Design a protein around this ligand. Structure first.
Ligand SMILES: CC(C)CCC[C@@H](C)[C@H]1CC[C@H]2[C@@H]3CC=C4C[C@@H](O)CC[C@]4(C)[C@H]3CC[C@]12C
Ligand SMILES: CC(C)CCC[C@@H](C)[C@H]1CC[C@H]2[C@@H]3CC=C4C[C@@H](O)CC[C@]4(C)[C@H]3CC[C@]12C
Ligand SMILES: CC(C)CCC[C@@H](C)[C@H]1CC[C@H]2[C@@H]3CC=C4C[C@@H](O)CC[C@]4(C)[C@H]3CC[C@]12C
Ligand SMILES: CC(C)CCC[C@@H](C)[C@H]1CC[C@H]2[C@@H]3CC=C4C[C@@H](O)CC[C@]4(C)[C@H]3CC[C@]12C
Lengths: 384, 389, 390, 384
């Protein structure tokens, strides 16, 4: 495993200087350097949901459906434990970029995500486990800069299947807002409601993320929840804070669920990366040529070689723009010649209608690991 | 009731010349004149869903919940009956623009739409009827021009509640594509699946819109469907074409009339509709001037009235003026937010007038719901709105 | 090895829509066009190209499970359409007595033979026996219709595949083929419809659905889905793919890609095939000179060889000569029938040489079955020299 | 009911003079006057298959599927009882021409035929009975004149459904040849095999029609048959002649006997019409405007007005030709303007894939009798 990555240098670049006039625009359309990023891609950032994968591993061994949903809800809230300290923008991943995590013997799963689209940005992620579950999602990130705060709505639906019982849990994301852009330290806060539904049994769960108010009495970053049966009974209750702990009680004896693992040593200068976040961008053999570990500007930023990372990002973005212009030119030729035109489609994911949520979602085809074992790539375009 | 609008002028403007290099761009970001529009706003076009409101009126008188879902399924398809001929772009409504339709004695409902946002574009629609139902929705229109076709996806969820029984139906729209852009003559095609769900009684309905193919041996523009009970299966089956008719039969594993419970037939277009933008009989009466409306109603938009009366060149100049006023107002709001952000002073962002953004308790989505205050303010005739139009 | 390169296609600018402008609703056989839109192959050779992926049938003969064998046969039915994606040229309308052989026992493992049995309506009988334990036969009557936007081609007929070792007799029809975008020039082909395979020995069935290409669709282009059922109605194997590239048959139980039983990948086009009528690696060696064939073989047709070497201007005149020769011969047959009917003398009508028109015992239809006399006569080289069609 | 039609006039026109040079052509492409026709359309001639509907009426009351198949097999031969003397060509129906037979109380069925396609000629026929059966078919008439004889092959598949048991019998027609055209004295002969298959039980039946030979092997116009179970046993045996009778014996002695109804009085001068064939072209109320009873040239020829009937047939053929040219011009405009084009479709029949025969056939949609009840029509083209 790989820990201790080089620290963040001090270049004194005022964030407000670039985002001064860019009020009301999307974060993707805001030209930014690499100084305010972290050496991880959005795919690597998204795969971190499996940081507390033991919750799903223990949930697979629950006979009671309601108690299993209590475990699933704790897994939904556990993902925001990295949001307390990590206040950096991960690299906007390229159109064909992917990222794998083949950690079956050490952890028990094989994760794989790939950018399905860039206009608009969307990323499909799928992870298979040997303990009897599978987690998949397609996240389309939308954002808006209002001046005082930066609002981020990671749109999309997350699925979690349990092969032993057939339980299919699904839930949406919560809205995330980042404060203190002009001056002072940066901090993040989630607010809204997450509604989990089990389509196999009919169980539901409602989690409420309370926004921070000074005179609210409500503790900061508080999360309350209730898991209900198809009839109406409240049964179990959830309480905690997404910054520290989360416990599951019963109503009619306290079971307790999730406590975040502490940050590694001297992590204050390593972008506040978790112990799992360190091993994400470690070089690995047998990955696809479009994996995030091979992105040049990301590695150039990880080792502290800035200024050149800006130029490498500029070149990579110009490459993607020329590829898009060529694809549009092919479509323009095909529409005038009368020939059919087949647009861009994702490589390892297919856009089909989800049978339970009735949503156009990207599902894993099931041929990435086979091709990785056989080491037959090439297919993947020259992205970097 | 207005029965005929001035005819459509003949201006020779090549559409492909404008969208030649505009490959991959959004329709809102496509600089085009008023020549390829219709004298209706997107709010009025969205209000046209109530054209076949008799289906919901008869659905309110259905004791069987499954048969009521059979009526609602035909109501979902009835909205696409107007797309067969009308291949014109409705006016992109301004930020504060609204549109009312207070037709209780003539039709039996009160419709109200308002453009809720422009980044991204969203429009909230709410219409309550005295016959026992209410229809509401928030439509965020997304579009993309890929060359061969221009795809339009009206994202959003539509609700239809029956207060007497409490039935709450919800369904999404289907993907619409307009083809043949290089050459003048345009044609439209719908394709995809509509999934209706009743949240009070667990029964569901699935409609399948078959795409038009170069060589297909099915009927053109055919739609098939099934009505299933909660945790069961097919109780009714419906089939037809969104070009003309839609029939809903019953299954029991003779001729056609014996096993058919509900038929829907579209009313034909009025006389000389070839020169009136192929407007329906209901579409003609939408942009007729009415007294007692809000100052932001679509009937008062200068671009539409200038184009309806055939004064297209002035409509182009006026649309450029209206869009520049909206852009300057947006930049002024951005400057106010920037100064409040630097000084620490509080800032009140833009909020919709007649709609409030709350989480829907059944669909768990942040949608704009009508705050019952438009009709009450209309009777007292006090309007503290904006000067967008 | 065999022939791997033919002379290139010349660049002759002839507007196709100018000829098919007024001929709306007519058959492709009755529409007068030059040789510019043809390929140096006959319909008999084009039909013989069905045996391109015979490895699927070779492996199917070695399947103990009947249902598992049906997956290989089902992939063989779709494999023939892998060549239609780019090759959009009209094969020569063969003469009435024209034949075509393919005696490839050591190199491929079969003996194929085709003969035009009739021209009114057009019909061609094909029969190919293999030493790997199977036999493929068919009679294809090609009907067509030009509707304006597209040219519809329906190769009507029933094709059979028998396995001598087990007695399995598979039967299936072809799918509808349409060539679109004729008005401008850059024309393209698409198949659509359903193939229904039936095993008459066991009762297993298979259904393949070819989805038509549509203006807007969010599924894969040229997609084909299929299911194989036992005589009771239970779906054992399921297959999916695209006739543009691949076709896979997995197993269902009514994780990943571990249930895969049979994958079929199309053989890529040879080098510089861009200018060789997009011929496959097998399509090139079809019109290569062969010894010991019948005098009515397609390799001896003057129009194909005259056009293959790039002399299209003379190939048009030779096509006119052959068509007028065939028409005069048919007028001679009609005059003989009229004289024999007025004189009361018996009349012996035209009958096929290497095929016999008998009732098929399985499909109960009047089909042309191989008589069993072509290869034997080829060994002794005693051709009848009576047709004289070229 | 109609029991006597006007007699056939005597016109001295040599048929061989017209078909002298038309050897090898299709009967549809051979220009002929009305002198060699009969006052019936091809739809009415095809509807004459229901002449011996009592066979299906008794077949619906048969418990044994094999014994029922003997009745069905006799019904297949019963249709050829009229061809022994009737040597006239029915009128080639127009594109929109239909023909109804609403005889529920008198016979027990509702028949409807429609010319579904022209070029090539095709006719769909459907008849539902209240006695427990339904008969449907789509017949594409193909022909060829070889000089001595005219070969006619009525291609298509005929279906017979029994609602009580679900038995679905299917069989094709047999080839019919008309000889002695040069002299003038016409005679007809059938030859070939009819193969009936029951898809619900698996029973099969094979009928052999022997052609006329000079060496006269036993009886003329003989028909032999066998009724077999799905295993292989020849439970029943069939014998008879399509000239008179047809009987079904048992093997290890008479279950299903078919006797031909004789021709009515003075039928020698009425085109040898059967007792049912006379009532076919009788005027009926409440019919569609495209029914064969309203065809002008056909009725003009029925009353002996031949010379004028030729001109009326020329008018109808040119009208249909102009309509087809208009359809072709619409398609030519649609292909160049890029607008979609929807070709001609049948009115009362839909061309779908049959679930049992897996073939593209025209099935009755079920809307003719309802529209007859409401008496609207109009929607039908101006065919006459
Ligand atoms: C520095 C400023 C300008 C921008 C910072 C943006 C950062 C804080 C945003 C951008 C996208 C966000 C992520 C979007 C989606 C998810 C998945 C969820 O299951 C956990 C939170 C997580 C992982 C978010 C964490 C915060 C995040 C990384
Ligand atoms: C002029 C060219 C470039 C663009 C034309 C775009 C037209 C055809 C598009 C733009 C907006 C579209 C509408 C958006 C939403 C709805 C509501 C739905 O319930 C029925 C279809 C309907 C009413 C659409 C019909 C087609 C439409 C009017
Ligand atoms: C160029 C224009 C004028 C006409 C083009 C006609 C071409 C495209 C047509 C004519 C006959 C057709 C062939 C007829 C039969 C078969 C056998 C089938 O198993 C695969 C397709 C195949 C091999 C067809 C391919 C397309 C084909 C070659
Ligand atoms: C006058 C000369 C030139 C041509 C005469 C053609 C006549 C004899 C032919 C043309 C079409 C034929 C019919 C076609 C189909 C059927 C249906 C079958 O179930 C019984 C025989 C029957 C009813 C045929 C009887 C003979 C028939 C009427």
């Amino acid at each position: 495993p790989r820990t201790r990555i080089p620290y963040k240098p001090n270049y004194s670049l005022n964030l407000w200087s670039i985002m001064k006039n860019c009020i009301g625009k999307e974060l993707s359309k805001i030209p930014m350097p690499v100084n305010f990023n972290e050496p991880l891609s959005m795919l690597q950032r998204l795969t971190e949901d499996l940081e507390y994968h033991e919750l799903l591993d223990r949930a697979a061994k629950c006979e009671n459906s309601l108690e299993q949903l209590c475990y699933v809800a704790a897994f939904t809230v556990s993902s925001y434990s990295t949001t307390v300290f990590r206040t950096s923008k991960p690299f906007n991943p390229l159109l064909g970029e992917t990222f794998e995590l083949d950690r079956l013997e050490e952890n028990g799963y094989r994760s794989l995500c790939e950018q399905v689209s860039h206009h608009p940005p969307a990323a499909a992620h799928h992870a298979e486990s040997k303990n009897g579950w599978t987690l998949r999602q397609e996240i389309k990130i939308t954002s808006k800069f209002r001046g005082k705060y930066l609002s981020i709505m990671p749109l999309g639906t997350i699925h979690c299947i349990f092969h032993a019982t057939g339980h299919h849990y699904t839930w949406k994301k919560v809205t995330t807002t980042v404060h203190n852009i002009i001056v002072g330290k940066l901090w993040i806060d989630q607010s809204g409601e997450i509604d989990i539904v089990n389509h196999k049994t009919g169980d539901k769960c409602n989690l409420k993320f309370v926004p921070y108010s000074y005179f609210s009495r409500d503790v900061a970053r508080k999360v309350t929840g209730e898991v209900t049966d198809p009839s109406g009974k409240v049964h179990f209750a959830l309480l905690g804070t997404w910054d520290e702990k989360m416990e599951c009680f019963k109503v009619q004896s306290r079971v307790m669920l999730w406590k975040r693992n502490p940050l590694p040593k001297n992590a204050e200068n390593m972008y506040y990366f978790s112990e799992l976040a360190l091993t994400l961008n470690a070089w690995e053999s047998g990955t696809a040529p479009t994996d995030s570990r091979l992105r040049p500007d990301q590695r150039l930023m990880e080792n502290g070689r800035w200024d050149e990372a800006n130029a490498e990002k500029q070149r990579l973005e110009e490459k993607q723009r020329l590829s898009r212009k060529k694809r549009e030119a092919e479509a323009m030729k095909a529409t005038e010649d009368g020939t059919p035109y087949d647009p861009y489609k994702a490589l390892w994911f297919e856009r089909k209608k989800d049978p339970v949520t009735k949503e156009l979602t990207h599902i894993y085809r099931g041929e990435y690991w086979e091709c990785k074992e056989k080491q037959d790539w090439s297919s993947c375009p020259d992205i970097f």
